[PDB]
Design a protein around this ligand. Structure first.
Ligand SMILES: [Cl-]
Ligand SMILES: [Cl-]
Ligand SMILES: [Cl-]
Lengths: 317, 317
């Protein structure tokens, strides 16, 4: 069949060995259909994640300050020391979770890694999600936070980033800034972005059962897309920003992996950006699934992701 | 459950639909193990490729001149229209063919595309191959041709590129220049390089039966590696340049695709280059198999490859 990737770090090999190869069958059949089933999936998953966040916060020694910005919950994450290159810049993090998971403290996982590994202050947006708040609630929240932080720091001193759903939301958001004539962030990061909610990217098929994190589109992933979308067609560019326009995008850093089910959508975004004359850096990791650099963040591969992101953003300071 | 990639061009869809792709079992089914077999296989395959070349020549209207450079056959390819930015620059092409295919006129397939689409004079090296001339004959040939051309043009006015085996050979060649303190070419291109002759890259397993050009390692591909290597262990860095040092490499453009069995080798090379401070641009195409931009060159995808390569190299003139 398929061995653990032989050329990856021994640390990452150990990480992969410790999860059983989960079941495509069991992932496909897991689909909430009632309000109580969605609520409990979300609440139980978030409770599990909150413990990880507490440990990470203590480990890296970051401060986490709970704010309200124009009615949006935001957590400001400050590392023990800051990189001099990022003086007077800040980073706005848009978390992932397939548009249904990781509200509250669980939202700040990547935000902690960014703050600590880049040495930059991070504002992680705790945006609204279905079932209660489907599209466009999350987009409205990001807009309202950016309007405040852009006035306080200047657009050209703001970096933004997000993984997975947060990456897709970010692309949709920047598309909206551009079509409304509003100044964009200096540079952005999209980690394995959910750039198309439909089952269109080839790797959704070919890395089914290979991506150890997403596993398949056909269970909660597609169902989470439909819940977020409501009666909006899934090809609407603010749901699926691959279908929007990338003209005038700020320089973008895109991360994915050879086993990632969102490999295709990440490279589709890269291609459409380059065709629009956008500056991009694509960084694809051997052997890596969707967001593996988050899931297994104490690996050389994870360190590499944030090292290369730092080098990229430093270039625009 | 593996549909034709839905977002690729109509032209590339027609190309994939109409191609009769061998099963993995067929491609394993057999493999030359004697002289009759290797010579028969090579001749038959080369005959078909010769047809493609004669037709591409006619279609693109390039001029081909037959050269002998220190006993090495080289074909000089001049397009009907030259790009002004490439005045006094030339390109050296190192063809692919798994180190056994496409000697003779068949060798110039990518050289034609490069000459026409970049508008640059191309020297395509017709290097010696097994079974008659195993490693290091091809590498010696490239060495000889570069010495003469570098004298003629200056190294900073030479670009070099290669696809598949030719890409691997070019990486090995450039490592050798650097360890001997010899001035390297200005910038280089490696298209889906064979950077590791062992079955190590994860995509050799995961894109088995998905990559429509290579299909599987475990047929003629792995056999061709062993024929080329002879009794040299496959991890020798001049066979498998992923195991060499990429420090001081010139800026490199790397191309691959999400279905490519050499996706992994390509991104492994990219990661070692970036870790060694090398400037790279990585361009991954949705839905594309090994060298699909050559096999199906009359597609928007293929045009995009060379458009992006041209942009990259023009930046270094
Ligand atoms: Cl997610
Ligand atoms: Cl890149
Ligand atoms: Cl080849």
């Amino acid at each position: 069949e398929v061995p653990i990737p032989q050329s990856i770090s021994a640390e990452f090999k150990a990480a992969l060995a410790q999860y059983p190869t989960p079941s495509v069958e069991e992932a496909r059949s897991f689909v909430p259909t009632t309000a109580a089933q969605w609520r409990d999936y979300v609440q139980a998953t978030n409770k599990m994640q909150k413990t990880k966040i507490k440990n990470m916060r203590k480990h890296y020694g970051v401060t986490v300050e709970l704010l309200d910005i124009k009615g949006v919950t935001v957590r400001k994450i400050t590392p023990k020391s800051l990189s001099p290159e990022f003086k007077d810049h800040v980073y706005i993090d848009i978390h992932g979770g397939a548009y249904v998971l990781f509200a509250g403290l669980p939202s700040i996982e990547e935000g902690i890694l960014i703050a600590h590994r880049l040495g930059i202050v991070v504002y992680s947006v705790d945006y609204r999600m279905p079932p209660a708040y489907p599209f466009p609630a999350a987009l409205d929240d990001v807009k309202h936070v950016y309007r405040v932080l852009s006035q306080q720091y200047d657009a050209n001193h703001i970096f933004m980033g997000g993984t997975s759903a947060g990456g897709g939301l970010l692309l949709a958001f920047v598309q909206g800034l551009i079509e409304n004539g509003v100044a964009t962030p200096r540079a952005i990061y999209a980690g394995t972005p959910w750039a198309d909610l439909t089952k269109t990217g080839d790797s959704l098929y070919t890395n089914e059962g290979i991506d150890r994190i997403l596993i398949t589109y056909d269970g909660t992933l597609g169902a989470s897309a439909r819940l977020y979308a409501g009666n909006t067609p899934l090809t609407h560019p603010k749901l699926s920003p691959i279908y929007g326009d990338f003209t005038d995008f700020p320089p973008t850093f895109l991360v994915t992996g050879t086993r990632d089910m969102f490999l295709s959508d990440t490279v589709r975004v890269n291609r459409k950006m380059r065709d629009a004359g956008v500056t991009t850096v694509l960084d694809v990791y051997e052997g890596l699934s969707h967001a593996d650099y988050l899931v297994s963040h104490q690996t050389p591969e994870s360190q590499s992701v944030y090292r290369q992101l730092k080098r990229f953003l430093v270039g625009f300071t």
